[PDB]
C-alpha cells in the first residue's frame, strides 16, 4: 500500500472545470450501454458548483425564508 | 538475515543469551565516598515575628 497515491483522487475530466461555477451542473445519469454510448462517471465528470457544494437550504435561512417573512410582516 | 539493527540503543546489545552485557554502566563514585547530592532547607523565620 504505497502512500504516494493512496488517498489520491482521480484526474478529473477536462470538461468538468468549464461548467457554471455559480450554479452546479445539473444531475444527469449517463448511458451504461455498448453502442455509441459514453460511460462517463459523474464522480469526476460533474461540477458540484460553488453554492450547491455548501448547501444553502438550511433550517433558518434556507434561501427562501425572505418570502414568507415578507408575507407575515405584510 | 536482515541488516544490522538501527542505531539508537537497539544495536548496543545482542539477543543471544551468552552475550548480553546490559548497556548500563557502573557509577564512578564507589560506595565509601557518597556525595550528599541533595539537601533540604527549612523555612526562614520572619525578622519581625515579635510584632
Amino acid at each position: 500500500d504505497p502512500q504516494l497515491m493512496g488517498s489520491q483522487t482521480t484526474q478529473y475530466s477536462r470538461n468538468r472545470g468549464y461548467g457554471d461555477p455559480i450554479r452546479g451542473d445539473l444531475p444527469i445519469v449517463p448511458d451504461d450501454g455498448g453502442w455509441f454510448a459514453t460511460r462517463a462517471n459523474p464522480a469526476h465528470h460533474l461540477h458540484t458548483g460553488a453554492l450547491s457544494m455548501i448547501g444553502g437550504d438550511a433550517s433558518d435561512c434556507g434561501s427562501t425564508a425572505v418570502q414568507q417573512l415578507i408575507k407575515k410582516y405584510e | 538475515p536482515p541488516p544490522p539493527a538501527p542505531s539508537g540503543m537497539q544495536n548496543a546489545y545482542s539477543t543471544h543469551p551468552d552475550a548480553y552485557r546490559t548497556p548500563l554502566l557502573a557509577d564512578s563514585h564507589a560506595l565509601s565516598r557518597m556525595p550528599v547530592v541533595q539537601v533540604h532547607g527549612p523555612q526562614v523565620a520572619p525578622k519581625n515575628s515579635h510584632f
Binding site: 502512500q3 | 538501527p6 539508537g8
Partner: protein, 461 residues
C-alpha cells in the same frame, strides 16, 4: 493624608466600579494575573552533529549530496558552512588600472541553487535563490537582521570594490567562513520534526549544487561602469575550484517511554512547498504589457514576483532597472534613476478580472504591512497572499490552483525601465550598455505528508 510609599492612592481606582467594569472584569470563573499555571512538559535533549559527506566533492559549479545522520530521534535544524577563498587583484587585469573586483551582493542565497531534500529518491521539496531572497526579505524578524546580513556575507567588506595593487586600495578580500541555514519543513517549526526513529531504513539526502566562481565575482570598471567576466589570470592565486563546505544538523533525543509510545503509528504532517513558474524574457521596447500563465497543483498560499536585471550574468540579486556602479570611497552605489520595473500588476481568471489593475505600491507596501511579519527594504519583491499570516505554519486562507482554471498574471512596464533598456547612458550611470530584464514568479503552497510503517509519501499528490 498622602506620603511617600503610599498605597491608598490606588484604593480610589479599586473602588471605581460600574456596569462596564462588571462586564469586562470580575466573575467567579475569571482568570487572574500574578498567578501562572504550571504544567509538565516532555523530557528531552538536543545536540549538534556533523553530517558526513557521502557523494562528490565540495567545489564550485558541481553538485554534491549529504546523507542525514541516524541515531537521533528527531532532526529539526540544518545549516551549511562554507569557507570563502582569498581574492588578490593583480595589475595585469584586462581593465588595467581602471578595474575593481568585489563579491556579489548577497553572497549567500548565491552559490547555492536547486537545494533539494530527497526521501530515498523522492524529491520532497527544493528551493533556490529567488525563494531564499523573498523569504528573507518578507519574514525576517528584527534583531536578527544584522546577524543574518553578517552571516550571509554583506559585511561591507565583500561588497566594497578594491582596486589593483598599484592603486591606493590594495586591500584583499578577507577569507572568513559563512553560514547559511537551510529552510525546510522540519526547520519551519519545532512541532514538525523528522522521525528518524520511525524511518530507520529510509535514507534521506540533501542535494546542493554550488555555483561557478566566475559568476560569483563582479569585475566592475571604475569609470564607465562596465562588467566583464573574470578569468584565472586576472587575479593572483588563480581560481581554486575546490572549497571547504560542511553541513551541520541538530538532532534531538527523547525519553524511552515517549519513544516506545510513539513508535508504531501513522503520523500526518502539514508542510509548505515551493513551485517556481518557468522564467520569462521581457523586452519593454517591443511591448509594454507582459502576461504569464500560472500552473500550480496544491493549495497555494502566497505569490511572490519581481523582475530581475539579467544584463550582466556576474551580478546577481539585482531586481532594479539599473545595475549598481562604483562610487566614491571605494564603495558601491545605486545611480539616481533606479526604480523597480513594475508599474501595475493584475490577475485574470479565464477572462475574468479577479484582481484589478492595482498599483505597484499596493503589492510593495500594503500587502506586507497587513499580511506579513516584515516589509522589504529593497526595491522590488512584490507579493500577494491569500492567507492572513504567511509565516504561520498553521493553515489559513488558501486556494488550490490545480482545481482552478487557467490564471494569468499581467504586468505593465515602467517608462524608466523602457528608457533604461536602450543604452546611451553616460559614465557611472549603470544603463550605459543596453539592459535586458527577466520576469520570475514563485508560489508557496500547502501539502500533506503521511508517515506509516517506516515510509514516506504524499497521499494527495
Amino acid at each position: 493624608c498622602t506620603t511617600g510609599a503610599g498605597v491608598t492612592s490606588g484604593f480610589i481606582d479599586l473602588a471605581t466600579y460600574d456596569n462596564l467594569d462588571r462586564a469586562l472584569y470580575g466573575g467567579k470563573d475569571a482568570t487572574t494575573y500574578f498567578i501562572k499555571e504550571h504544567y509538565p512538559v516532555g523530557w528531552f535533549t538536543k545536540l549538534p552533529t556533523m553530517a558526513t559527506r557521502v557523494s562528490g566533492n565540495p567545489a564550485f559549479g558541481q553538485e554534491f549530496s549529504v546523507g542525514v545522520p541516524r541515531s537521533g530521534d528527531y532532526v529539526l535544524n540544518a545549516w551549511l558552512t562554507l569557507k570563502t577563498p582569498e581574492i588578490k587583484l593583480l595589475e595585469t587585469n584586462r581593465l588595467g588600472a581602471n578595474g575593481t573586483v568585489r563579491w556579489t551582493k548577497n553572497l549567500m542565497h548565491n552559490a547555492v541553487e536547486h537545494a533539494s531534500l530527497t526521501f530515498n529518491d523522492i524529491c520532497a521539496q527544493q528551493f533556490n535563490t529567488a525563494y531564499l531572497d523573498a523569504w528573507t526579505q518578507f519574514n525576517m524578524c528584527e534583531g536578527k537582521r544584522i546577524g543574518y546580513d553578517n552571516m550571509i556575507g554583506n559585511t561591507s567588506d565583500m561588497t566594497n570594490p578594491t582596486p589593483a595593487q598599484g592603486q591606493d586600495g590594495a586591500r584583499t578580500l578577507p577569507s572568513k567562513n559563512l553560514v547559511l541555514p537551510l529552510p525546510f519543513f522540519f526547520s519551519r517549526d519545532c512541532g514538525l520534526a523528522l522521525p528518524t526513529v520511525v524511518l530507520p531504513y529510509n535514507e534521506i539526502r540533501i542535494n546542493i549544487k554550488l555555483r561557478s566562481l566566475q559568476e560569483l565575482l563582479v569585475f566592475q570598471n571604475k569609470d564607465t561602469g562596465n562588467v566583464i567576466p573574470i578569468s584565472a589570470t586576472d587575479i593572483a592565486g588563480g581560481l581554486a575550484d575546490t572549497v571547504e563546505a560542511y553541513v551541520y544538523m541538530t538532532v534531538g533525543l527523547v525519553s524511552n517511554v515517549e519513544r516506545c509510545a510513539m513508535a508504531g503509528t501513522v503520523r500526518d504532517m502539514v508542510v509548505e512547498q515551493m513551485q517556481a513558474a518557468p522564467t520569462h524574457i521581457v523586452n519593454p521596447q517591443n511591448t509594454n504589457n507582459v502576461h504569464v500563465d500560472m500552473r500550480f497543483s496544491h493549495a497555494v498560499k502566497a505569490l511572490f514576483f519581481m523582475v530581475q536585471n539579467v544584463t550582466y550574468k556576474s551580478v546577481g540579486s539585482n531586481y532594479t532597472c539599473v545595475t549598481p556602479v562604483n562610487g566614491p570611497g571605494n564603495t558601491v552605489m545605486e545611480p539616481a534613476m533606479s526604480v523597480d520595473p513594475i508599474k501595475s500588476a493584475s490577475l485574470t481568471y479565464e477572462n475574468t478580472t479577479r484582481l484589478a489593475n492595482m498599483g505597484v505600491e499596493y503589492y510593495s507596501l500594503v500587502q506586507p504591512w497587513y499580511f506579513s511579519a516584515s516589509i522589504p527594504v529593497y526595491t522590488g519583491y512584490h507579493m500577494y497572499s491569500y492567507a492572513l499570516n504567511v509565516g504561520s505554519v498553521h493553515p489559513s486562507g488558501s486556494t488550490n490552483y490545480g482545481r482552478l482554471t487557467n490564471a494569468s498574471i499581467t504586468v505593465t512596464m515602467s517608462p524608466e525601465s523602457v528608457v533604461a533598456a536602450a543604452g546611451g547612458g553616460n559614465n557611472n550611470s549603470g544603463y550605459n550598455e543596453p539592459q535586458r530584464f527577466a520576469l520570475v514568479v514563485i508560489a508557496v503552497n500547502h501539502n500533506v505528508i503521511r508517515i506509516m510503517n517506516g515510509s514516506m509519501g504524499f497521499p494527495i499528490l
